[PDB]
């Protein structure tokens, strides 16, 4: 396995023409404030190919 | 692009604790914690242990009990994994993913394997 490749899978909003996002900030899936801090309705917005 | 970098890990010979690094970078690293998982030759891959940012509470599956240790530095943003009482059974490449609560086919690096020599 190659997992070096990653992708982004969650975001508030879909991106414009020729948009490069690059923010990990982590994403927030509920109505409680993540805070950058992992948790319930905290998830981590990159996910890999491998 | 955040880089795993995970420190290879040689081969030791039963009789003393092992000591392994895995290293992260490319993103702040005290936001969200990070997880120790191996996947042995012959097998899928299994969740070994997690390790929470602010509580830092070792959570590990039970049949790896009492000998199994993390500990987390961000100074140096990275982890370092101990065993004890290491066996032949250890075999296997313990890699690293970024913890979350799933922990399920997230994000990893290639990591190292590491075999115990009798």
């Known amino acids: 396995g190659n997992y070096n490749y990653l992708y982004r899978l969650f975001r508030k909003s879909n991106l414009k023409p020729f948009e490069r996002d690059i923010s990990t900030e982590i994403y927030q899936a509920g109505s409680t404030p993540c805070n950058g801090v992992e948790g319930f309705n905290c998830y981590f917005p990159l996910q890999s190919y491998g | 692009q955040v880089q795993l970098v995970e420190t290879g890990g040689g081969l030791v010979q039963p009789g003393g604790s092992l000591r392994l690094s895995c290293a992260a970078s490319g993103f702040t690293f005290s936001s969200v914690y990070m997880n120790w998982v191996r996947q042995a030759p012959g097998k899928g891959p299994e969740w070994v242990s997690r390790?929470?940012?602010?509580?830092?509470?070792?959570g590990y599956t039970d049949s790896v009990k009492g000998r199994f240790t993390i500990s987390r530095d961000n100074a140096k943003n990275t982890l370092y994994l101990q065993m004890n009482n290491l066996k032949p059974e250890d075999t296997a490449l313990y890699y690293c993913?970024?913890?979350?609560?799933?922990?399920?086919?997230?994000?990893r690096g290639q990591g190292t394997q590491v075999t115990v020599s009798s």
């Open positions: 390790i929470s940012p602010n509580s830092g509470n070792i």
């Open positions: 993913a970024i913890g979350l609560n799933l922990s399920s086919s997230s994000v």
